[PDB]
Structure 1
Amino acid sequence: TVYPLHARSTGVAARQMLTDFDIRNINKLSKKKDIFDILSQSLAPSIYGHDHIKKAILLMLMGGVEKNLENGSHLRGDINILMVGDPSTAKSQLLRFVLNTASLAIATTGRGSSGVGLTAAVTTDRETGERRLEAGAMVLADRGVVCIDEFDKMTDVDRVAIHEVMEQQTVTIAKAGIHTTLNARCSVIAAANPVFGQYDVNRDPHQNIALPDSLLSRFDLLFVVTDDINEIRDRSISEHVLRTHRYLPPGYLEGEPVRERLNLSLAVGEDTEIP
């Protein structure tokens, strides 16, 4: 027997079953005027501020329609956003949250990634004993989302591959006697750092980024995050972070390490409102 638990929830599948009560509640909440704002704020409650970023993230997770036009024309429906900002501005934590939330999310690091291991690898089979292709980081994320941290740190030679991906949603292989075209219709979210240690507002947003403007063009949105030192905003951020850090799990005591077992598979298989 095979039971495909997924979505990192440890017990449910990626295609989560929808009860009639849940569908009715979804329809009722769809009539809320600011349901968009409610869902955006409900995404990452532990992340203070960044409301428009959360709106863009919610738009990415459930994006627009893909136009499969005639004569080979193709208009992609996925939304790819590059967000560049100062260090320790929850840039990586937002991507981690998206990974923990999205149905199909694949993590990637600019330093910890190779183009062959990103798109397709020419390996050899062992059961039969002959050549084969293995999917990379974006092919596996087809119809999904790829969260790339340290985007500015990616190798240039392998950066053209992701450029082709976000350009036409397809990769091509013409090596080792293999001439194929794989489909990776993924949505790309990237987190980036300025060329300097911090962003320089005195300079145009071209020299502040070590990436080609052609590479920036295919992104639907580019979000600039500035860690400007305020006082009221800093106080609110500190209070929110301390409220977060003082949270205690329900089945846990104070001064007790948070051990993990995850043996919740007690059985294997399937076994208006304004909040």
Structure 2
Amino acid sequence: PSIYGHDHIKKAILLMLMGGVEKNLENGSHLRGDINILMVGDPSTAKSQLLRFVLNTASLAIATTGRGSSGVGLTAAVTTDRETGERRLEAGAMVLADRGVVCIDEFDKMTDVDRVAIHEVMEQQTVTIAKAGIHTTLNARCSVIAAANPVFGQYDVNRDPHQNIALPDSLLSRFDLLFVVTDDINEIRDRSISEHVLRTH
């Protein structure tokens, strides 16, 4: 209730909270029931204050930042058990949020080597580990909400959409709803939003 506007995005978040029905199909397949949303927009457009709200209101939520994450930190890491002595696996961000949500911020600022792993989790919803004699498939069924910025500082309407977003097409196809949000200068909007912000403070 502390965000002014963005009604459609708030409807999309609610639809994320109540996910779809997953269908198990022959040939060992499953149709995903999760809704994945991406938000691209201008600076200071309340993109990051909705991810924080989803972190709090949801039952299970994991927060991630693009530049401060790695592939081995999202899927799984090989470690050792001091008490007994074997070699084991430690869960990462994606697999810890099974039947939950992952909120990624500064999604475009993530390195390419990091961005491939999230691709697989977005496609198969499973992680494959084949390192150090540990051959395992791990279940990761999570919903992804992400926020990013265009290639330039602000969205340009005189250029084609693909030029504005630096993300590849294969990654972009795996999001159910892409919301492009823009801040437009208008006196009535400014008068209302400034009043709301000053009332909040």
CA deviation after TM superposition for structure 1 residue 221, in Å: 0.5
Matched residues in 1 for 2:159 and 2:123: separation?
A: 28
CA deviation after TM superposition for structure 1 residue 129, in Å: 2.1
What is the SS of the residue equivalent to 2:179? strand
CA deviation after TM superposition for structure 1 residue 196, in Å: 0.6
Matched residues in 2 for 1:183 and 1:235: separation?
A: 49
Matched residues in 2 for 1:74 and 1:116: separation?
A: 26
Matched residues in 1 for 2:130 and 2:163: separation?
A: 35
Matched residues in 1 for 2:128 and 2:159: separation?
A: 37
CA deviation after TM superposition for structure 1 residue 98, in Å: 0.5
Matched residues in 1 for 2:145 and 2:42: separation?
A: 17
Count of residue pairs brought into register by the alignment: 201
Matched residues in 2 for 1:78 and 1:202: separation?
A: 34
Deviation string 1:29-57 (CA, Å, 9 cap, x unpaired) is xxxxxxxxxxxxxxxx1000000000000
Matched residues in 2 for 1:231 and 1:167: separation?
A: 45
Alignment gaps of 5+ in structure 2: none
Q: TM-score, normalised by structure 1?
A: 0.72
CA deviation after TM superposition for structure 1 residue 184, in Å: 0.6
CA deviation after TM superposition for structure 1 residue 234, in Å: 1.6
Matched residues in 2 for 1:178 and 1:229: separation?
A: 56
Structure whose residues are more often strand by fraction: 2
CA deviation after TM superposition for structure 1 residue 229, in Å: 1.5
CA deviation after TM superposition for structure 1 residue 91, in Å: 0.5
1:138 corresponding residue in structure 2 = 94
What is the SS of the residue equivalent to 1:138? helix
Bigger CA radius of gyration: 1
What is the SS of the residue equivalent to 1:147? strand
Identity of aligned residues (%): 100
Structure with the greater relative contact order (CA < 8 A, sep ≥ 6): 1 or 2?
Answer: 2
What is the SS of the residue equivalent to 2:24? coil
Alignment RMSD (CA, Å): 0.9
Deviation string 1:135-168 (CA, Å, 9 cap, x unpaired) is 1101000100000000001111011111111112
Q: Is the counterpart of residue 220 in structure 1 residue 158 in structure 2?
A: no
Alignment gaps of 5+ in structure 1: 1-44, 246-275
CA deviation after TM superposition for structure 1 residue 238, in Å: 0.9
Q: TM-score, normalised by structure 2?
A: 0.97
